Amino acid sequence: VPVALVTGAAKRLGRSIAEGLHAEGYAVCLHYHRSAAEANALSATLNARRPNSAITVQADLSNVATAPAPVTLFTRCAELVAACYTHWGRCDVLVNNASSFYPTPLLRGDREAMETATADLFGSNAIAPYFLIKAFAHRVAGTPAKHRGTNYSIINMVDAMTNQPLLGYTIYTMAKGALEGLTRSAALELAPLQIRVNGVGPGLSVLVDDMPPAVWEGHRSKVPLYQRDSSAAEVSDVVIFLCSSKAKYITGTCVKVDGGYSLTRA
Amino acid sequence: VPVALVTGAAKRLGRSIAEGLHAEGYAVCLHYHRSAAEANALSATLNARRPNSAITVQADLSNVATAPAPVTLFTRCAELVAACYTHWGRCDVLVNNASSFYPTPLLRDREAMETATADLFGSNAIAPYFLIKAFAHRVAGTPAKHRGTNYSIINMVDAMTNQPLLGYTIYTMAKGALEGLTRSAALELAPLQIRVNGVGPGLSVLVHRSKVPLYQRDSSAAEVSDVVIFLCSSKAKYITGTCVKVDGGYSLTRA
Amino acid sequence: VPVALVTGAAKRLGRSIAEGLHAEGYAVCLHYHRSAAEANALSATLNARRPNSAITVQADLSNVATAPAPVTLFTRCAELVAACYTHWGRCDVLVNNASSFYPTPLLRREAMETATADLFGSNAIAPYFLIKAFAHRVAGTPAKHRGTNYSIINMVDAMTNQPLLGYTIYTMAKGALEGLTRSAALELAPLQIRVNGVGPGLSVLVRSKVPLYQRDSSAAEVSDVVIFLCSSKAKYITGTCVKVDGGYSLTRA
Amino acid sequence: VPVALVTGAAKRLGRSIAEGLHAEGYAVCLHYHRSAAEANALSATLNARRPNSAITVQADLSNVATAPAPVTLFTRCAELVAACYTHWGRCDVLVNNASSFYPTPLLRDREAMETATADLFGSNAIAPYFLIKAFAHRVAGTPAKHRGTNYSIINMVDAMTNQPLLGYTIYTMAKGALEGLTRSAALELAPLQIRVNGVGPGLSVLVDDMPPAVWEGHRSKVPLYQRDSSAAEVSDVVIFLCSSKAKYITGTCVKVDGGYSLTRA
Numbered sequence A: 001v002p003v004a005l006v007t008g009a010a011k012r013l014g015r016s017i018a019e020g021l022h023a024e025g026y027a028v029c030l031h032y033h034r035s036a037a038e039a040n041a042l043s044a045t046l047n048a049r050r051p052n053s054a055i056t057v058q059a060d061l062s063n064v065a066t067a068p069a070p071v072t073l074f075t076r077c078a079e080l081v082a083a084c085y086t087h088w089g090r091c092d093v094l095v096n097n098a099s100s101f102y103p104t105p106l107l108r109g110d111r112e113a114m115e116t117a118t119a120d121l122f123g124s125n126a127i128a129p130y131f132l133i134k135a136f137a138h139r140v141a142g143t144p145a146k147h148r149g150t151n152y153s154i155i156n157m158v159d160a161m162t163n164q165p166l167l168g169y170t171i172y173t174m175a176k177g178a179l180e181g182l183t184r185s186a187a188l189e190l191a192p193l194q195i196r197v198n199g200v201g202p203g204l205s206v207l208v209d210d211m212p213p214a215v216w217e218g219h220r221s222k223v224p225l226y227q228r229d230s231s232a233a234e235v236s237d238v239v240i241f242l243c244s245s246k247a248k249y250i251t252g253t254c255v256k257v258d259g260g261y262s263l264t265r266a
Numbered sequence B: 001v002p003v004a005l006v007t008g009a010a011k012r013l014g015r016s017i018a019e020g021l022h023a024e025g026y027a028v029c030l031h032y033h034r035s036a037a038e039a040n041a042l043s044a045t046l047n048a049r050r051p052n053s054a055i056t057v058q059a060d061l062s063n064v065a066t067a068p069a070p071v072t073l074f075t076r077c078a079e080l081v082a083a084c085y086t087h088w089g090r091c092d093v094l095v096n097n098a099s100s101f102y103p104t105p106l107l108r109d110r111e112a113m114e115t116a117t118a119d120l121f122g123s124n125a126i127a128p129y130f131l132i133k134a135f136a137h138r139v140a141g142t143p144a145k146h147r148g149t150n151y152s153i154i155n156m157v158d159a160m161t162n163q164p165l166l167g168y169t170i171y172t173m174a175k176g177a178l179e180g181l182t183r184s185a186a187l188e189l190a191p192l193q194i195r196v197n198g199v200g201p202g203l204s205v206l207v208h209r210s211k212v213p214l215y216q217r218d219s220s221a222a223e224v225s226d227v228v229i230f231l232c233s234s235k236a237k238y239i240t241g242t243c244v245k246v247d248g249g250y251s252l253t254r255a
Numbered sequence C: 001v002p003v004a005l006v007t008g009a010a011k012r013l014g015r016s017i018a019e020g021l022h023a024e025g026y027a028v029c030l031h032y033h034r035s036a037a038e039a040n041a042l043s044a045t046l047n048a049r050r051p052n053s054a055i056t057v058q059a060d061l062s063n064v065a066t067a068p069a070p071v072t073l074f075t076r077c078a079e080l081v082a083a084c085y086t087h088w089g090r091c092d093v094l095v096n097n098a099s100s101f102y103p104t105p106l107l108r109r110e111a112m113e114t115a116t117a118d119l120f121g122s123n124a125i126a127p128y129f130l131i132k133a134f135a136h137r138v139a140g141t142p143a144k145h146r147g148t149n150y151s152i153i154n155m156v157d158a159m160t161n162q163p164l165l166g167y168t169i170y171t172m173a174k175g176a177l178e179g180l181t182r183s184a185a186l187e188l189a190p191l192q193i194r195v196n197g198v199g200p201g202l203s204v205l206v207r208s209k210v211p212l213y214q215r216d217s218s219a220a221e222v223s224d225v226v227i228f229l230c231s232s233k234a235k236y237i238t239g240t241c242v243k244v245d246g247g248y249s250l251t252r253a
Numbered sequence D: 001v002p003v004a005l006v007t008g009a010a011k012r013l014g015r016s017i018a019e020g021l022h023a024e025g026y027a028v029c030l031h032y033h034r035s036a037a038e039a040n041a042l043s044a045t046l047n048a049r050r051p052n053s054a055i056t057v058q059a060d061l062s063n064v065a066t067a068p069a070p071v072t073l074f075t076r077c078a079e080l081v082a083a084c085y086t087h088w089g090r091c092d093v094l095v096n097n098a099s100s101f102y103p104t105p106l107l108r109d110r111e112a113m114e115t116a117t118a119d120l121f122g123s124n125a126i127a128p129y130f131l132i133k134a135f136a137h138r139v140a141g142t143p144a145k146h147r148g149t150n151y152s153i154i155n156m157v158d159a160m161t162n163q164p165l166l167g168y169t170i171y172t173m174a175k176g177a178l179e180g181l182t183r184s185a186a187l188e189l190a191p192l193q194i195r196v197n198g199v200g201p202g203l204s205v206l207v208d209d210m211p212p213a214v215w216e217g218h219r220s221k222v223p224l225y226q227r228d229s230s231a232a233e234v235s236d237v238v239i240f241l242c243s244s245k246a247k248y249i250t251g252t253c254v255k256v257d258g259g260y261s262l263t264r265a
């Protein structure tokens, strides 16, 4: 029985990925920051379906130190991975899904806002994933060959549309670019350990409708395939496949799940 | 019971892709050019496993005219797709797998230059274009209520063409053209819900490998075909116009 | 005095590139297909400004045979490059600019064969043969008598990754041209022949979408980049593309 | 006389870029962190060649607060740009060249890692971001009637990051982020006519702190010339992208790698 660690697993795409992996037989460590209620509800559902098949761990993945000597992001990430080993004695899959997403305009309080966004946006999207991957790899390396799993797989949730930047989201876009870099670098360095590292990049998935219906419909209408945003499963299914043994030759690449959105022009 | 058309399905990756799809329940149209024996042997196996689940069609996919007025590549491609409709009344998946691959050095005749161009460009790019056109036309001509629910076109590309193989310019160009076809076809065919994606192996079933970061070996046919099968599945119904490299990290290397 | 061969040099970008190179001191071979008048007018201007600094040569770059044994595209391409050597004894720069551009819809008949040969010929196959002919001549030239700055520019397209609805063949041909750039650069490196691409977005339209200036570009705004890539200051650049699209390729629908 | 701000301008490519721009008529603000001597020697040369055509500014571009309330990286970046306006009343070109480069292996303390992250990410990505922000803020605050006619930002990226260098994850990531900054900044800053492009060297003025045969093997891998590039072979491209003849280019990268990124193992 393999174990998967999914960050930001409480709702939306994170939950779908956790459910997807759980359906495949994985025990799942559900990470969360502020959504304790949803995360615990998910753990309860999964555990009821299969005893001892889900746990939850809380952690701010922003690049800042927390209250205990202050606790660093790295430590917090190492503990995330450790929680898996302590509870199930293993960690086969890591999905870097947690991510902050808000505007950081270059054009037009301001001090803490700019410094907090950087740590938050870059922490969740890039730096935490880096430390998490490091911790994940250190545990595999420290495991005697004969006792290692046969299918280690790390999935980085990237973004199919960052090459056509979203106006006013520079830091987020930068962090995603860094995450793409982490995928390529990690794949290469971790190859000898047979740890595959790939990226999955959604375009528009379960789009939040905090706007006039016509503006919500207009956005969806842009996606060439189906003229709609995707469902959570339409993304998570791809994540699950990349984690399957049938994908054991794939590493260091990205799979876009955008219904052709990245093919469009203004 | 859906139908898949697989060009160059006689051996290696093509055969694995055909077997893969067949295992999923697809009736398979096995195209071939010169490998009649192997194609028929594959058909026999597949048919024995499941009656009327496989057929074979021969066709030179090079960009030239053949003997019947002369028959053009387009016609030959249209007849390929037609064979599916004539036999099973449908064609849900098209896998552009057939491909010539040999050197066309820029640095050191006339006949072998024009034959290579038509051959390398035909199989890798032009035939796939015509095949996609024929495929789309048949779907468009089908009344909505009678259409399939999962049309998928897979273009077998190359994960290493951005790091060209010395001396293989035409092939490399043809592959680039196939990449363009993937993006263009995906966009144009979206309204008809026909997804178009690419699968790019790096080193698969080499008849060099120590340079592959993952496993330090070329891949097996299944390691590639499984990806093709997944992209054809309904679980991949939101993926279109993209490429999936199956290279074990080879495209990440430098000299 | 170096020589530059510019295909489709009669008007628009081709003409601007030819003028740009000529301004840098290049003798220019202006290729054309149907635009004889404009090409000859340009030659006259350039020749008046500097005697024996321009010539014009006609050639269909479509992948078809033409009547003088039928003449193939390769031969026609080889003669294009040869014309330069015959007249000036050299060919330092080749700019693959000539290009057909029209719809080949997949949804709603030899016109498919004429389009294929035309769109693929001008955009990809002719460039391939031209590069081949160009490289041969350099290789056949004794080291001591070779130029010091061989440069091949392939006019590509900054927007083909975001295909233009209904232009599949053209888009494919451009993808092949991109492939030719990378392959040619690698193979021709030992001969010090640099091969790069320049990809305009919207230039000299026959708009409000272009993030930069909200307008298509002028011909000079593209050709200047072609000229720089041909200069000695760019001697370490090869196998890459420079987009000249004012940020258009950064947009979404 | 237009002004160019060049980070890490003391030596190597930074110096070449500064010299290049200076040769084009630009007054140059030479930024440096540790190389005061080299930077001041360069300022002297440029100033002798043309009075009041160069100044130096020191600043740690790592993502850490410094001693004067502690001073943040943003403030330090804002002061860098300000120094240009205070001295010459303008800032037309910004070249994000400063960059840390060392291994951060994934496979086998507290200070070295936290310090590496802030350093590698600060110089390569975050400082560039703040610098661009500050640069854009001052242009926006300038009345259209007093604005320059050729604002240009160049981000020094890396032509080989897509084929990562074993053991350099953070650096590679930071470069990826810099690439994202280029695309995002180009789009957002288009209305102000501020072009943003990248220049990515492959192997330039390769350090020879190794056995000659090893150093030669490394260069031999580059398809064109079989050698690393000179500083000018890179800087000349930066200067071209900053010229008015490149006014339609924005949001793109120009590889200066002699075909290195075309190779396989």
Ligand SMILES: NC(=O)C1=CN([C@@H]2O[C@H](COP(=O)(O)OP(=O)(O)OC[C@H]3O[C@@H](n4cnc5c(N)ncnc54)[C@H](OP(=O)(O)O)[C@@H]3O)[C@@H](O)[C@H]2O)C=CC1
Pocket: A007, A008, A009, A010, A011, A012, A013, A014, A031, A032, A033, A034, A035, A036, A059, A060, A061, A062, A096, A097, A098, A099, A100, A101, A120, A123, A124, A157, A158, A159, A160, A201, A202, A203, A204, A205, A206, A207
């Ligand atoms: N949905 C879409 O259209 C697209 C999504 N993506 C990518 O897919 C992934 C998932 O998408 P989606 O479901 O929309 O993501 P969400 O926006 O819904 O956020 C996912 C989770 O990330 C967690 N998170 C955010 N910041 C932090 C942080 N500072 N520390 C720890 N956890 C944090 C949150 O957990 P909690 O609630 O517990 O606080 C949140 O639930 C993301 O990485 C995203 O970048 C890419 C393109 C498009």
Ligand SMILES: NC(=O)C1=CN([C@@H]2O[C@H](COP(=O)(O)OP(=O)(O)OC[C@H]3O[C@@H](n4cnc5c(N)ncnc54)[C@H](OP(=O)(O)O)[C@@H]3O)[C@@H](O)[C@H]2O)C=CC1
Pocket: B007, B008, B009, B010, B011, B012, B013, B014, B031, B032, B033, B034, B035, B036, B059, B060, B061, B062, B096, B097, B098, B099, B100, B101, B119, B123, B156, B157, B158, B159, B200, B201, B202, B203, B204, B205, B206
């Ligand atoms: N194998 C690898 O390491 C790599 C493969 N690829 C791509 O994957 C795909 C399959 O690879 P692989 O199995 O090795 O392919 P093969 O080289 O084994 O050839 C596949 C088939 O293509 C057919 N074919 C060749 N030329 C023509 C033509 N003129 N007209 C009609 N059919 C033709 C042949 O059919 P027949 O024998 O019946 O005549 C052949 O069996 C190809 O598209 C290839 O480009 C990409 C990268 C690497």
Ligand SMILES: NC(=O)C1=CN([C@@H]2O[C@H](COP(=O)(O)OP(=O)(O)OC[C@H]3O[C@@H](n4cnc5c(N)ncnc54)[C@H](OP(=O)(O)O)[C@@H]3O)[C@@H](O)[C@H]2O)C=CC1
Pocket: C007, C008, C009, C010, C011, C012, C013, C014, C031, C032, C033, C034, C035, C036, C059, C060, C061, C062, C096, C097, C098, C099, C100, C101, C118, C121, C122, C155, C156, C157, C158, C199, C200, C201, C202, C203, C204, C205
């Ligand atoms: N303009 C733009 O917005 C864009 C242009 N580009 C590329 O830049 C390059 C130049 O652009 P532009 O000036 O608009 O090009 P044009 O469309 O104006 O065509 C250039 C020339 O190509 C020649 N040509 C066309 N077909 C053939 C053929 N079958 N055989 C020989 N010559 C042929 C024509 O020569 P003649 O008139 O003598 O017959 C024509 O003058 C092209 O490669 C184009 O693809 C890319 C993106 C955008």
Ligand SMILES: NC(=O)C1=CN([C@@H]2O[C@H](COP(=O)(O)OP(=O)(O)OC[C@H]3O[C@@H](n4cnc5c(N)ncnc54)[C@H](OP(=O)(O)O)[C@@H]3O)[C@@H](O)[C@H]2O)C=CC1
Pocket: D007, D008, D009, D010, D011, D012, D013, D014, D031, D032, D033, D034, D035, D036, D059, D060, D061, D062, D096, D097, D098, D099, D100, D101, D119, D122, D123, D156, D157, D158, D159, D200, D201, D202, D203, D204, D205, D206
């Ligand atoms: N040279 C090459 O082969 C390649 C270079 N590049 C890129 O090109 C650019 C220039 O290359 P190169 O000349 O080799 O760069 P260098 O490695 O020589 O360093 C450039 C300068 O960056 C400054 N710097 C480093 N860290 C900081 C920091 N923490 N805060 C402030 N300044 C800092 C240093 O200034 P000081 O000495 O004053 O402390 C140094 O002089 C870099 O961005 C590099 O990433 C990309 C690929 C290859």
Ligand SMILES: C#CCN(Cc1ccc2[nH]c(N)nc(=O)c2c1)c1ccc(C(=O)N[C@@H](CCC(=O)O)C(=O)O)cc1
Pocket: A098, A099, A100, A101, A159, A166, A167, A203, A204, A205, A207, A219, C252, C253
């Ligand atoms: C907002 C949002 C979420 N999204 C998707 C999106 C992307 C990344 C994410 N990342 C994370 N962590 N969480 C998310 O919820 C998330 C959501 C959108 C992105 C782009 C467009 C879009 O293309 N709109 C037009 C805007 C037109 C205009 O303003 O001129 C465009 O073409 O840019 C719409 C929605």
Ligand SMILES: C#CCN(Cc1ccc2[nH]c(N)nc(=O)c2c1)c1ccc(C(=O)N[C@@H](CCC(=O)O)C(=O)O)cc1
Pocket: B098, B099, B100, B101, B158, B163, B164, B165, B166, B202, B203, B204, B208, B211, D264, D265
């Ligand atoms: C030959 C062959 C089969 N192959 C695989 C290959 C690729 C595409 C195909 N395409 C098709 N249609 N059929 C094939 O059988 C096929 C096989 C190889 C490809 C690359 C290297 C390689 O990387 N060589 C060296 C140097 C490459 C270079 O010249 O730059 C290296 O990098 O290690 C070796 C073998």
Ligand SMILES: C#CCN(Cc1ccc2[nH]c(N)nc(=O)c2c1)c1ccc(C(=O)N[C@@H](CCC(=O)O)C(=O)O)cc1
Pocket: A264, A265, A266, C099, C100, C101, C157, C163, C164, C165, C201, C202, C203, C207, C209
């Ligand atoms: C037509 C034409 C010429 N052109 C420019 C163009 C491009 C390549 C060429 N290539 C050649 N050889 N000759 C040309 O004259 C030429 C001209 C255009 C290209 C794109 C759009 C455009 O982006 N239109 C839509 C998007 C279309 C889509 O989404 O598919 C938009 O909304 O902006 C408009 C005009």
Ligand SMILES: C#CCN(Cc1ccc2[nH]c(N)nc(=O)c2c1)c1ccc(C(=O)N[C@@H](CCC(=O)O)C(=O)O)cc1
Pocket: B254, B255, D098, D099, D100, D101, D158, D164, D165, D166, D202, D203, D204, D218, D221
């Ligand atoms: C180191 C370094 C600096 N560099 C160049 C480089 C890149 C970015 C920089 N960035 C910054 N800021 N400063 C620099 O001095 C700098 C230097 C190199 C990069 C790649 C290889 C290389 O091709 N390595 C081969 C090794 C081959 C082998 O030994 O088997 C490889 O496969 O990766 C060598 C040197």
